Amino acid sequence: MNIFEMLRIDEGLRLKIYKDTEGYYTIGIGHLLTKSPSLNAAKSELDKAIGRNTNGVITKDEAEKLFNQDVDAAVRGILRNAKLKPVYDSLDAVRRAMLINMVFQMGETGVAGFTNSLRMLQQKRWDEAAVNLAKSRWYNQTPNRAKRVITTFRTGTWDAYK
């Protein structure tokens, strides 16, 4: 599987503005519009982000393009990070997916704070990293989402993505 498909699973797809997990106006694949409590503020970012009056409504092609641009960010962020690059560079096709997944959801900084996990990942210390990642607030946060991630770092296959 594709990163696009894993993110639809974990993030979901949505052609019209909606509050996320925390209640933030979102759209497409895990797209944050604003923290602010103004649907009106959401639509205006939508539009700017689109370069058209969508009145919250986007079109797949729109969605698609968004995300890709979103994935792009994360990946570079990874590419610029001293803590992540080597870890990333080290992983197999699949575990690298989880990684960007992680950074797609929490940010570069938020993710690099995981010294220990990251190190094990590097050493290929699979059940150990997992043990550690399961102590995080982030695992408490989204346990359903954190569960698949860990599992897969555990496995090295997409098994859990079904």
Domains annotated on the chain, with CATH: 1-162 (1.10.530.40)
What whole-number distance in Å separates Cα of residue 111 and Cα of residue 74? 11
Widest Cα–Cα separation across the chain? 50
What whole-number distance in Å separates Cα of residue 115 and Cα of residue 149? 17
- Could you confirm whether 128 is annotated as catalytic? no
Active-site residue, from 11, 62, 70, 108: 11
- Could you confirm whether 62 is annotated as catalytic? no
CB 14 within 8 A of CB 24: no
What whole-number distance in Å separates Cα of residue 71 and Cα of residue 76? 9
> Is 40 a known ligand-binding residue?
no
**Which residue type occupies 12?**
G
Q: Residue 118: what are its φ and ψ, rounded to 5°?
A: -60, -45
Sequence-separated (6 or more) residues with CB below 8 Å from residue 126: 120, 153, 154, 156
Give the Cα-Cα-Cα angle 93, 95, 100 (nearest 5 degrees): 95
CB 27 within 8 A of CB 33: yes
